[model samples]
Target: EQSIQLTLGPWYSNDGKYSNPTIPVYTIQKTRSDTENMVVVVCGEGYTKSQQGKFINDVKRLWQDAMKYEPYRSYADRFNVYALCTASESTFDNGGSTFFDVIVDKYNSPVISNNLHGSQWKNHIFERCIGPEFIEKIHDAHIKKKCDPNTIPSGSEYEPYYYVHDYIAQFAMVVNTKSDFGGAYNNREYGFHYFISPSDSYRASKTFAHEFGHGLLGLGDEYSNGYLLDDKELKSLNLSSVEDPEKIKWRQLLGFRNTYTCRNAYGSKMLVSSYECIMRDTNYQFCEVCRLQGFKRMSQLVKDVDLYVATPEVKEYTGAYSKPSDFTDLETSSYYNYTYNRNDRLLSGNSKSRFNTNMNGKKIELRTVIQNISDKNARQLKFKMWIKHSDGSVATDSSGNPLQTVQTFDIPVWNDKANFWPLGALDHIKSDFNSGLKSCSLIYQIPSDAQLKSGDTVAFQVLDENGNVLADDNTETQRYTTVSIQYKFEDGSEIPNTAGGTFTVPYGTKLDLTPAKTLYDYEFIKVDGLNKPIVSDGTVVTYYYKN
Candidate 1:
């Protein structure tokens, strides 16, 4: 029955005055995952690296169990979990009083046996297991030993611990000791979560979920643990002092069949639902009040996708000089001194329409421009493009299978000053310009292996930095725009005399050319005057074809 070791000493002087200079460090193994959202769990076993694998496995199990519940289950893909294994030189004192025992007794008072359960006992566990303020106490102790604030004094040691809550994690969990035991929950700024015991695997998931109610969802315990002396002043979402069921926070759950009553736990009386809850005991689920509150708390962090505006319009355009007639009168225009290039024509498409993706073997270039129409400023943008098959609206991959494959692109914020004539003010530029500039344009080539066919839909979405839908242009919700091109052909035998014409297409235009009938086959072979072979399904490809 070994316990984790901790340096337990008075934080302040016996005279009761402020005394610490530097922050106290503790045994910490900082780790991070690649995912945008991260969860950190640590073991306080203080075991060496040889025993670290077991501690890691235990934490992985804890995470697996927690993710099986609501909120976490739904958003599991959005998170990456990290386990911090801290090794200790000395094993926890089991026979006699360890530092944990002495500290809990001193803080909780009226010493509880074996430190199994009690309000004061739970409080001490919180200070040790889940802490920010507790770290400061350890710092103060070092100051008492006359150690330099910057250095740990001789025979004394310190390590790093999470201080700032926001940058560290949204929530955290701690596992310590091998004894079968209950856990404490605190809803402080730095969030106090469950402290699991190794022997309590059967009830571990329930205990973790129960504490998450407090740590992640801001829930209060239904049954007090001898610490409800001030129930009237308490503001827990679950426990309320109000007697009227209709006036309670969870009044929606009250009705003829549903029963709510005033109950006393640990001396204080409060209104609670009759249904048993995990907060009351690990065996039960969250009561109606706790369930609703948990849902409400989680909702604030994740909301509907309306907060961002990501709309991508794809088109195919010739170069800026590809159509010089459009800019012929620019010298006599109001803004004559401006320099323009093929990029400008591509950027400000004079005329473009939604083109088909069935151009057989021909190089089809697509220019995509995403606009931020939302009120909020987005720091980053992402694109997920997929091709939709026609049969029953089934989206498929390049292989034409049932599964849809998405190509993701990380788009940096639009920089106006770095480029000439920002896309935001296209009207101001009256001359030739860099139409294919990197500003708002995301040019993509339709790969040769794309196997694109007629009636197959090509769709794209704009997302916030976190991959949440800011704005999407699916067939269902047409929040974004689509533009392509059209071509006409005559039934002439020779390819030379096929009555043909080319329109001034804008940049960012996705061209999908229609195949000619059996009498006269028409296929988009290549862009005129470009030497490189066309590879459509790929990254952005740029070229200038001069006559």
Candidate 2:
């Protein structure tokens, strides 16, 4: 047999049309990233050049056919398909068991019929011997590129197939002969693998997709092996031994469809969402239970890390950076307004971690950095800011509706938006040096009457230009910590606090804290404090003083 590899690029023409030779000609659909998982498909059994061309054309249909199913339709963007053309030296040598027997018991029938019946099958040698060798050839290529053949990992039976089981192979499929037969199984380290005979094209397409559910997502066969596999033996999301709908793995989908428990090959009763699912039979679509599992599996394999906020390295007072009391030439905007404090003292020469705010009537400006961790450069991104209270409640408006602070900005703009900078490349997101990191500072303010208190969290989210959530599924969120600094007198007297100062716990406000504290009198004498402590620095401490 001879082998050739071709990368299957997406066809981009408006109409489903291809130029001559049609093997590698098309407006290629490129992936967002350079690296794509490989799925190796090879053919054997004396495939002629014409037959080989037909097989390659058939492989193109895998993508379209796969997406027609539930979860795959939604997450097919994550996979890359390839065809490995392997032409065998001769046609398949069937071992007398006829095509019918071969289809039903693909693994053992040929061996059973040829030896016992004294059948003379010319292609028998090619069918039985070629498949394994063809796989070996593919493995040899993989071994050469990904692992060292000489020093195999312990427990690896085939030194050349080391690391084969590490990840589920993106590649699978064996095309050979004209038999209407196919089977799905796994090779150690290589994940799921499949075989398809061209004679069964219609059945093979469905088979191809069905096998993928097993090979790619680790889905179990919905069909019963005719006996039983207990709940303990059941591993597929679609299969369970539990009878109670609420306790089943697919409880959420139970009410919509009735599930049946059937006997498997092992003589154990197993659960199945339906008798007609693709996993069990090709005519029906994936059951609701199967779709949900598929969705989760795809979500686990592919993550969208487009945009996020990150806490800046908080620096303590090094006497270098200064706090300005006035904002004369500083840029201002509707969203980020700045004011000159010609009178109030500023805390100069100190690096601040927490942004300071007061219960007083003036709005406080908080600054932090946000990062774009995706491969594509972000432009005109929309942002949404909100607060999560420590009590597990979200900040709400007077109407009891959640508060939404939203804005849209580009890399450069007039007003305070011009301060926004572009994050560097993906690698820079994890770099230690501030300059090496791709980040930009965002300044937003909390209104004095913002209705937020200590332990309330302020967070920002990045969105696409049109304001849709950027990363699709909600996988991650970045948050910054908030704090209040206050002080109280031993006699229960209290004083208003300053930015880096302290204030008394306000009356009528509930405090979740320890009730008393240590104190110092007019002569700095220690005394016990009264009333429940409420306010605190980003740090928690009790202070008592007597004048």
Candidate 3:
């Protein structure tokens, strides 16, 4: 239903607009899961893939270097990195209309060199260029790849971006220059994401990291001659302007002596979290304050795996539900209806009536789902199943032991992908129900038996190997239901009986359809074919009688 929707951008054109040129994005690295945020990477003018064999490697390596640091290292799975391989006709400082039109700021310099105050460095270049215009164009070109992985005009993210169309969490662009003149800063008003550096900057790794500190964390530069901190900067975890030593933001943390003085160009004596941090210099690790900030943001943006068990509409076995809602069976009779439950995480631990249990050997199934929001890293888990009798007691076997079993599933991470989990059985399946990377589903079966009691409830729990429960705030009890029964009337006129009658009511007990030998003074005659009660639509029973 969401095939086409349009918005104006520089990527498309109209008259009088020298801008709005559509650009193509080449895929570099795909995301492991849908829950990961997007970090759209781009290049400045004159950098093309034909540059070298290592061109692609060099670009993707910047992101790998980024995650090698703290905060990011511990949670590397939270991002799906991609690159924009845009090239230009001329080199840097040559002209405009090039990708990003990247160049140092000509207006910000104080003294004119070569009769140009905005004189370029080393052959007429500048040190800064924060052009919102070009950045918006990059955004237009980047989103051409959808955040929905399974959709056309596709992207690498596993989860649909808020599904309303995802916005870039961070947009990083590296200039084609070899200048260690690494420059980076985020779009403050446009939603925090824009970092720049030379393709081969001085220590390209840490440069990107330090720049990210400014862009994503909103950390202010701690050294003197830096820009003044706004209200937004004061609210950051590391920066503090308090006069007292004990009043500094990182005062609660140790080793953060007043060794570093933070006097902004605005001439204010500000306080920072550490004597030497990435913000002040790239050599130092993030202070406790910044580390906590990174973790806090990652937590808010990414979700961990939620192992859960929710209620299914239980009824008599009809084989109808055998087909999975998300996947087609690779083998015949292997269908599993893994219907999407938007609130599956919220539905954990609830119990409800499945259907009538009065009949013998009434089989039921539980549609168990596991939702891992971006946690592609596999977690070892166990499933413990047991039964509770009608009298509210654990059902035991004849040996006086509790009738329970412990089963193990590699329990692959499901980030809402429609693909089946535990690969081997479903290795051949590859579906795009727009359910990829959202959750994983499996049907838990409760085998029917003649001795299975009326009020017995089959229940199971999800637990870590250490016996920890991933509770989603749910609780309830086993359920039951009863359906109507219809047979022949005494006056030989009851809906015109054929060999069998259809049971129209659903969500009820199965009828005892094996007729008596002498019904209505008629002898029971032989019959053919199978007679079974359907679960969803209707039920049928067969027999014949003659006077």
Candidate 4:
């Protein structure tokens, strides 16, 4: 039967006519960054040549809409799209798996180096879903038929899994028309499939965030695994590790414990579990893990594709729910205004550990030890090191809300939103010229304000001498001499496990690890103070007394 060509009309519905006035032409979110070059392909039940084309167009639209989500919408310029209708033949050797390679080889495609290979998102779909033999068969079949080497199977008659899981499409939607249709995904046997309600294309698009989670970052779903799920599926880095209690990566990095088990546990390795994280079952809650992974994934892609890839310039907090301050420069003419000052002041200076008490129960100490004060830079550095429960007689709450009467301490500027700097706060490190000392000790205590208890996370900034910044994440390359810093929890105990928990607690923070570090916070003893012992002029740094 000859395939009927379908065209996507601005007003067409399931009936294929300009009937519904209620649904405007579906709008796609646009990428705002030029550096990223990710094209999200949407494969659905394309029964006809025309329908395939329409599906292709719809995929573009949906992808645009999804990109509209902040932090990604600005990266629209970096993406494009391709649509294939079914399990088809290609010129590539490994079924559709190698289709992207063929595109690069024959279609003059730009080489994407980060995925390790030139293939982009399509590569993940092929490797994760499509079978090797199937890809080979398609390429052979296309060669024998003398068809366009790049063309693959199309039309609605194709199996639903063919398009969504393999070399065919980055994201697919198999329109079952009825609810009885079943589809396969994460195709260990051949490829992935997904069956869906024919009328609802919107929900179909959301799957991109799911499967891609696996294909992109080695992230596994936090949901309990069913039979046949790969070990990588439900457990990436375990979030709940009872080993080495002070080793909880998140807690330890912030100086929480010397033996971490809560955040450092294997269960907390994945950052996607929260009250409503997508990693959770049946709901669309993006947990802290998922968001962190998303940020990392997106950042890596954006950095490679565009020159300017960053969150909108956040100035101030308009309201708890209002858009960020940077949106003011994008589209003006509304009542929206950006504020530089917010309800809080984030601290400036780097800290390896954080100390806090658990809802008045136990003092949580970070695991990492501080060897020395390598550096410090900030306008005014303060630490939300300790948190005490409100006595009720004191004024001001944790969030600056009124308690009842006045108080003496705050979390300090631990969470200050008005640090005045653009990219996080500053990194302030005080250095000594060194009169005779070989290594210096560093000490820091939580400020009175920003009182934290139980579930609260205390964050401190890393600053330089002049109050600039050297690094946010541990991406910097520095080592301590000998002097140790220490963390004194409310009750003054130490935590253990500190390895797998929060990325921000690790990638965005630092830690102290050296000798003379006994307790958790006191892991590094400030024999002198948080400041480095000043070296006399001509003291000469680097200990190069090789003379």
Q: Which candidate tops lDDT?
A: 3
Whole-model lDDT, model 1: 0.36
Better of 1 and 3 by lDDT: 3
Q: Residue 375 deviation, candidate 4, in Å? A: 21
Off by over 4 Å in 3: 1-24, 52-55, 93-97, 106-166, 188-192, 224-234, 255-268, 305-547
- lDDT (10s digit) by residue, model 4, range 400-426: 753221111111111221221112112
- Model 3, range 61-178, lDDT digits (tens) per residue? 6766776566665455345444544454444444433344455655421111222222222111111111122223333222333222112224422122222113344556665656
Clashes of 2: 19
Instruction: Give the TM-score comparing model 1 with the true structure, all chains together.
Output: 0.38
Ten consecutive residues with minimal summed lDDT in candidate 4?
A: 497-506
Whole-model lDDT values for every prediction: 0.36, 0.37, 0.40, 0.27
Could you tell me how far off, in angstroms, the CA of residue 93 lies in candidate 4 after the best superposition? 34
**What TM-score would each prediction reach against the true structure?**
0.38, 0.41, 0.41, 0.33
